[PDB]
Amino acid sequence: GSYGQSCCLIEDGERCVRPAGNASFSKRVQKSISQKKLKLDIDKSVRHLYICDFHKNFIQSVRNKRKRKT
């Protein structure tokens, strides 16, 4: 209904519909995306700050490295 524990992100125009958990979109997350110029916009329709755990890892991936570990 108006309530819906799902994401608030948009990627390339696909309004993310993955289920939302403990993950959210604080004013600190923004700067990590701005410094990376990703296609990750914000759904103002539900006017909420929840994200799916798939997107939670994505913004945490840009702080890591594509080089694997032992």
The residue ranges that bind Zn ion (CB under 5 A) are: 7, 9, 16, 18, 52, 55
Q: How far is the CB of 18 from Zn ion (least distance, A)?
A: 5
DSSP label at 19? B
Which of 16, 14, 47 lies closest to 6 in space, CA to CA?
Answer: 16
Q: How far is the CB of 48 from Zn ion (least distance, A)?
A: 12
Q: How far is the CB of 64 from Zn ion (least distance, A)?
A: 18
| Cα gap 33→1, rounded to integer Å | 30
- Which residues are bridge partners to 11 per DSSP? 14, 40
Nearer to Zn ion, 14 or 69 (CB): 14
